[PDB]
């Protein structure tokens, strides 16, 4: 569904246990009500809430898990440009 750009400013704001957003690829996700059900545990998401998790997410998930677990309403929309360096997760 053809959806609106979201700014990095707004994303960075969503970064706590009960208001958690993430940027995978260049897209935005509200992972808040998903938390309790993450087979990878809550912490990993919490620890990285409000960040770009592309480099961690992508090597641990096949491209077809997002649509199995996550309601499309929670696929928030595409990122406007890019997350600031400080808020992009790198491989460990």
């Amino acid at each position, epitope marked *: 569904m053809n959806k609106q750009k979201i700014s990095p400013a707004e994303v960075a704001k969503h970064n706590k246990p009960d208001d958690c957003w993430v940027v995978i690829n260049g897209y935005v996700y509200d992972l808040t009500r998903f938390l309790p059900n993450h087979p990878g545990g809550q912490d990993v998401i919490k620890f990285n809430a409000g960040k770009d998790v592309t480099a961690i997410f992508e090597p*641990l998930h096949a*491209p077809n898990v997002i649509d199995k677990y996550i309601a499309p309403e929670k696929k928030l929309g595409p990122l406007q440009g890019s997350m600031p360096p400080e808020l992009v997760c790198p491989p460990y």
Partner: antibody
Amino acid sequence: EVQLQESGPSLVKPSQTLSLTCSVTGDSITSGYWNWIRKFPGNKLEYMGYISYGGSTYYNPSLESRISITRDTSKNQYYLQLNSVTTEDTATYFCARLFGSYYFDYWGQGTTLTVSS
Amino acid sequence: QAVVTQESALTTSPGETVTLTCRSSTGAVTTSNYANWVQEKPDHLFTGLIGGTNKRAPGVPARFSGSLIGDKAALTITGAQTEDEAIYFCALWDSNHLVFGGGTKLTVLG
């Protein structure tokens, strides 16, 4: 340095149930996505499906009714089951791993399977 | 279910740069398709080359690169070698299903 070896029959009559093994030595199958690929006689490759390092499955929507991928971490192997076999299933079967979302690292040698009465 | 289409065959000679491309039937390929490329040499030999559009697999010669050219994924071989003579398969993640095309036969004039 990391080997995938496929096992199974070389021949099976149509109607039967084919059973394939992939033995993995050099790395734990609890790490990447573990998959099945077919190479038909005409050069066409077909992605069969996968099992995760957690046991989660996915199957080609054309094979859901037949295919079944299992795994046993103890022996460090996974499996492919494909019943209601048909002439069309004649091909060479490969297991390969997928650095989830990225590239294929590690393919097996493959085993040829023939379906014939 | 998208159909992934790629060149019948391509001929080239050592040293030259060659590009192989990969089209999905439903629309333009973006990085969300996580384009993937594998090579098949004679004797059932398969090697993973590219993943996530432009990520080189380990052990893969730097002459191999992937990119997004127009509306399709692209495999670039910069300075092709005679041993690069083999069949190249493209794969796209479309509609939560991973789909191979019919592959390209790349001849590298030896």
